[PDB]
A paper describes a structure:
Our previous work revealed a curdlan-specific endo-β-1,3-glucanase, CBM6E, from a marine bacterium Saccharophagus degradans 2-40T, which contains an N-terminal GH128 module and a C-terminal CBM6 module. The GH128 and CBM6 modules form a cohesive structural entity, jointly recognizing triple-helical β-1,3-glucans.
The crystal structure of CBM6E was determined at a resolution of 2.4 Å. The CBM6 domain forms an interdomain interface with GH128 primarily through hydrogen bonds between α8 and α9 of the GH128 domain and β10 and β13 of the CBM6 domain. Notably, we observed a Mg2+ ion within CBM6E-CBM6, occupying a similar position as seen in ZgLamCCBM6. This ion demonstrated an six-coordinate octahedral geometry and coordinated with Glu357 OE1, Glu359 OE1, Ala379 O, Asn467 OD, Asn467 O, and a water molecule. In Model 1, the triple-helical β-1,3-glucan displayed a favorable structural complementarity with the CBM6 domain, while its nonreducing ends made contact with the GH128 domain. Model 2 revealed the triple-helical β-1,3-glucan spanning across the active groove of the GH128 domain. Overall, both docking models, in conjunction with the crystal structure of CBM6E in complex with GOS, support the hypothesis that triple-helical curdlan unwinding precedes its hydrolysis within the catalytic groove.
Numbering used by the authors: 85 to 473
Amino acid sequence: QDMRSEKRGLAYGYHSENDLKAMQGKVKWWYNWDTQADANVKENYASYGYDFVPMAWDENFNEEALRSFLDNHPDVKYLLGWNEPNFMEQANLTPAEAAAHWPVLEAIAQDYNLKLVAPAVNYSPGNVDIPGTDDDYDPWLYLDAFFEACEGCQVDYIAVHCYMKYESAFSWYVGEFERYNKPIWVTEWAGWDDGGPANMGEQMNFLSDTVRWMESNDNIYRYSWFLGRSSEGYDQFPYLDVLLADGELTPLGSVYTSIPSNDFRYKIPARIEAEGAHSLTGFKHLATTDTTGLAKLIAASNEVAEYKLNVEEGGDYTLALRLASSANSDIAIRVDGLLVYTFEDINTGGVEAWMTFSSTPISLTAGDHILRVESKSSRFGFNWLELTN
Ligand SMILES: [Mg+2]
């Protein structure tokens, strides 16, 4: 398949080569808050299609290690600036200070032909004084003061952190940063504040809502989920982990890496994870215990899933669905809006009893097509689909 997302990255510092291969061609870049790539992948990450974005975490970073790493990786194209300088417990730099030290990063960007990402901000506890305001917590008041102190400074991108749990809050809050007229990097996000996700499925729904919004926002240059693996583990609140055992994904990690960009098109024959729909009405996410697929979509009613196909060899394909359904369930299949097959009285006897149901052949001409999977007032689980010729 083509590269699944050009924007999608990951925040994690302990990749193995097997971890990078598990996500290959579904994750484009990553960063680790440090000046060089993870030790076990430093030599080979570029061969799996990734680019690594180094970071100057605060003003006292190790410039020698960063310049030395850059010397041997001319594939590096971007440099992240200070990390949460408006937080006391992080980089702890008032706007003037962060601009004062910015030439160190420009000199680096000049020597290696790099682009510079602004210091990452978020609503802060307010303990780094911004001049001329009492609202020291304010990420926009911080960046304004930064930019006014940084006259003539090379700043190519904005970096944003966000831990809101509501996808509409998230899109409103990240959109506020489009005011600066620069592409945006959401370099840390997950649903976490105000109680966060009630369960793993809530986090997967929130990841899906916000990933889909960012893939459709042209002003978002890049995003990276927080984070590859957590100290607490993937089934502990707030269910952050994208990677499970070496070289394998969590259910959430399957949703994260499967969601396609606007222009990506699936080639066939292929198996396509259900969580890789270009478009979801109503469908929700859960872990599955099926032997493959990691995550399922769940239907209670009339939910719709659409899959955008680049059919290179027109002809008749059989469509297979991997389903679970306690009772009788009906599923309509459409191509560019017109019914072609209906799965009737699907019944596996349990919500985690899985079977593969095949259709009669469906004619799929060469070109661009929307494959639509509609629940027909049915209650079932949907792991992946397969088209074969
Ligand atoms: Mg799946």
